[PDB]
């Protein structure tokens, strides 16, 4: 069964496909698996409460008696033929669930640091496939591999001190001089032969073999079927985490960086990955600000310690003199005013940095939308200047029209 969630959204167990007992068995393994692998991913003002909440089967999904509720952890996971995918709530609409997939991967393209191509994703737009995050990241792995295997096969050179019936390469002399004449019929050479089954090819044969076994599309089954035939002579391996560390990216296999990072993102039971929606917006806004703020340079994660260090998500300073704090919040900001938890942190970030502070918030049809300019000016009775900026999201499309509107509102703010 395929189940899909948006951030802070619920599904009924009666309407859902499959079995009632089957889905709740899949989740308790996933929330437990998120507990052991929680510390690998960074957060930003998450209020995670690592001791109590995550180990109570509330790590990724809150499984309840009457419904199934998603926390603010975005991504996907495939467990026990119950494929779960959690999209952001910002891309929620009012092919009907194919626009938020390419919106989320493009927000996973710019924020998280991936180097995927837009024409890789635009190939899938309109082919009426079943929307699934695991079916597209296997495709993004398989297409970027088959576009990097079609040119060259990555045959890397190792040297072997082999006793050959012929003579290839440099003849070892200290091993041939001390050769008895009863065994003179084989040369003892040290040939730098190119092997096809290197460590990077043992991984990509194993990463395809664990992908074709767990794929469900009709496009990925054809593409991984051609990749497995190209890797036919390679002896297979069992994938571990030691194999993904033992290879290093030099200049002769640098073009295999794009399929390998996606092969490390999906393989290392469980499959997939999860990230916090607060930090992914904190990373995504950081791409927008430094591009859109020419007058003043901006650094993310600068920290100033009170008295326990409370650090802003981003601060922009021209040289050192202007202190314009920019704290990225994923909150909906209901009733056109910041909440108690938000404005209390905005007060501290301005005071310990005469410092204006701007809060960027999400804006679409689903999320709360303010007017086009800088919506809310606030003073906290200390000559402060709190500006509520809102970035519109044309990221569901491929054109960046809202970046010009975000620059025009920031130019009036700067």
């Amino acid at each position: 069964t395929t189940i899909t969630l948006y951030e802070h959204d619920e599904k009924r167990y009666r309407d859902i496909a499959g079995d009632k007992k089957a889905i709740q068995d899949a989740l308790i393994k996933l929330n437990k698996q998120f507990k052991k692998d929680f510390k690998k991913l960074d957060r930003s003002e998450d209020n995670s409460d690592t001791e109590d909440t995550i180990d109570e089967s509330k790590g990724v999904v809150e499984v309840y008696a009457n419904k199934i509720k998603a926390r603010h952890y975005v991504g996907f996971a495939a467990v026990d033929n119950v494929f779960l995918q959690i999209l952001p709530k910002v891309f929620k609409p009012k092919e009907d669930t194919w626009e938020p997939i390419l919106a989320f991967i493009r927000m996973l393209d710019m924020a998280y640091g991936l180097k995927i191509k837009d024409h890789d994703l635009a190939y899938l737009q309109g082919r009426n496939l079943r929307p699934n995050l695991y079916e597209v990241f296997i495709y993004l792995f398989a297409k970027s591999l088959w576009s990097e295997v079609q040119r060259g096969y990555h045959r890397e050179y190792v040297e072997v001190h082999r006793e050959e019936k012929f003579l290839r390469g440099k003849l070892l002399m200290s091993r041939q001089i001390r050769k008895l004449p009863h065994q003179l019929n084989t040369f003892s050479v040290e040939v730098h032969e190119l092997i096809e089954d290197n460590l990077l090819n043992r991984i990509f044969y194993a990463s395809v073999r664990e992908a074709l076994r767990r794929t469900t599309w009709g496009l990925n089954r054809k593409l991984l079927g051609e990749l497995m035939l190209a890797f036919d002579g390679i002896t297979p391996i069992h994938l571990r985490t030691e194999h993904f560390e033992r290879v290093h990216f030099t200049r002769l296999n640098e073009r295999f960086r794009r399929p390998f990072e996606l092969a490390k993102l999906l393989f290392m039971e469980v499959s997939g990955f999860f990230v916090d929606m607060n930090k992914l917006f904190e990373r995504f806004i950081e791409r927008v600000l430094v591009r859109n703020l020419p007058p003043e340079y901006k650094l993310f994660y600068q920290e100033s310690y009170p008295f326990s260090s409370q650090k802003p998500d981003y601060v922009v300073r021209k040289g050192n003199t202007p202190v314009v704090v920019l704290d990225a919040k994923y909150r909906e900001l209901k009733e056109r005013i910041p909440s108690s938890d938000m404005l209390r942190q905005l007060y501290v970030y301005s005071r310990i940095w005469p410092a204006v502070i701007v809060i960027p918030s999400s804006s679409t049809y689903n999320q709360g939308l303010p007017d086009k300019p800088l919506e809310f000016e606030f003073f906290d009775e200390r000559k402060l200047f709190i500006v509520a900026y809102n970035m519109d999201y044309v990221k569901t499309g491929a054109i960046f029209k809202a970046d010009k509107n975000f620059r025009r509102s920031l130019n009036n703010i700067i």
């Binding site: 019936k165 012929f166 003179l184 054809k222 497995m228 190209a230």
Partner: protein, 392 residues
């Protein structure tokens, strides 16, 4: 319609110089290449005018052109004389056999005929005549460089070389000196005559315009990720399609009677009439079965993974069709789809069927995470024919 396939090879082999009969296995690519050379140069065996040679994964350049090899010398201790491979024993042979018919006033025809004897010698070279072989080979490449390009295009004996399974070996490593030479222009006598200096023996070497290197590439193994520049431009690729037109009643009768004898063709007529009467009196059954199963292969997987037509070409009864479907089609079908079951039953259009007359029946015990494993099921008699009559 096989003389056009002996003309499709023949029109490309005088224009590009060498071909590759690429196609799915069980088609006749080895048989078309072998029965074209035997029909052209009337020599039923290898050796003199053509040499059959297959490739493998551990085949190296030193076995093909030349390499240092230990060789015994008159039942005594070994020496380390450099041995010419299987190509250089026929590339030099195609030169010195063509240089008989050339009437020039500089040919050492007594010396060239002595070199031709030492090249066709089936025994290995003894050191009393190996130095006579290397000295006469030195006279050959002093003579070839002195002949003009006008007298090195019309060499009469067409030498051949059936490279079987050319994609199985590493093609760019075997053809070391033969991905700069195997063009029609880079041969001897052409406009771009190149005599390439070899690394091991140190003597210059150039392919003559007689040698045509026919290749028979299986493409269900070590697929189309080829060299794509060197081993793809030189070879004029001929697709040998798996033709189900040879699987009718008359076409199976015509194939198995021409190679047959007097008493064999009457028994092959009685056997094939018994076979197709058990199938439903369908004279076009095995054609329609192979054509239907080939369309399902080219839709799901690649178009060059189709089941060929050399398998069903040697059937005479239902029991022989059973032993070619369960040992040369269904193990071959489970090889292409990498032990998949939900798409291997759509090829037989048995996607929504289980536990009946199906070639892959579901086991009635699912796994822990809801997975299911199918199992091959042997059939017999009219149950198997009813399992074949719903593939169409």
């Amino acid at each position: 319609n096989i003389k056009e396939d002996y003309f499709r090879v023949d029109m490309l082999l005088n224009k590009k110089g060498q071909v590759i009969l690429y196609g799915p296995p069980g088609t006749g690519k080895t048989w078309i290449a072998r029965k074209y050379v035997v029909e052209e140069t009337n020599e039923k065996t290898p050796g003199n005018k053509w040499e059959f040679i297959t490739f493998h994964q551990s085949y190296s350049y030193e076995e093909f052109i030349e390499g240092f090899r230990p060789r015994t010398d008159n039942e005594e201790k070994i020496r380390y004389v450099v041995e010419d491979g299987i190509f250089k024993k026929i590339a030099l042979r195609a030169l010195v056999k063509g240089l008989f018919e050339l009437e020039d006033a500089t040919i050492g025809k007594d010396k060239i005929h002595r070199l031709y004897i030492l090249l066709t010698k089936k025994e290995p070279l003894s050191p009393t005549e190996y130095e006579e072989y290397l000295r006469l080979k030195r006279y050959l490449w002093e003579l070839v460089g002195g002949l003009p390009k006008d007298k090195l295009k019309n060499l009469t004996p067409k030498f051949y070389l059936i490279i079987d399974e050319i994609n199985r070996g590493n093609i760019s490593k075997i053809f070391g000196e033969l991905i700069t030479l195997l063009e029609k222009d880079k041969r001897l006598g052409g406009e771009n005559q190149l005599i390439v200096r070899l690394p091991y023996s140190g003597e210059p070497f150039a392919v003559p315009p007689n040698l045509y290197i026919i290749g028979t590439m299986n493409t269900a193994d070590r697929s189309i990720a080829l060299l794509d520049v060197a081993l793809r431009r030189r070879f004029a690729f001929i697709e040998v399609e798996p033709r189900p037109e040879f699987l009718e009643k008359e076409n199976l009768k015509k194939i198995r009677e021409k190679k047959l004898k007097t008493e064999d063709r009457k028994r092959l007529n009685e056997k094939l009439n018994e076979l197709f009467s058990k199938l439903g009196n369908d004279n076009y059954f095995l054609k329609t079965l192979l054509e239907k199963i080939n369309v399902r292969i080219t839709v799901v997987k690649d178009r060059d993974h189709r089941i060929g037509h050399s398998y069903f070409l040697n059937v005479e009864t239902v029991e022989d069709l059973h032993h070619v479907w369960y040992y040369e089609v269904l193990p071959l079908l489970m090889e292409y789809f990498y032990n998949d079951w939900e798409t291997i039953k759509w090829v037989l259009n048995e996607k929504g069927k289980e536990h009946g007359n199906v070639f892959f029946e579901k086991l009635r015990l699912t796994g822990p995470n809801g997975e299911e494993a199918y199992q091959l099921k042997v059939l017999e008699g009219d149950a198997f024919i009813g399992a074949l009559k719903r593939i169409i």
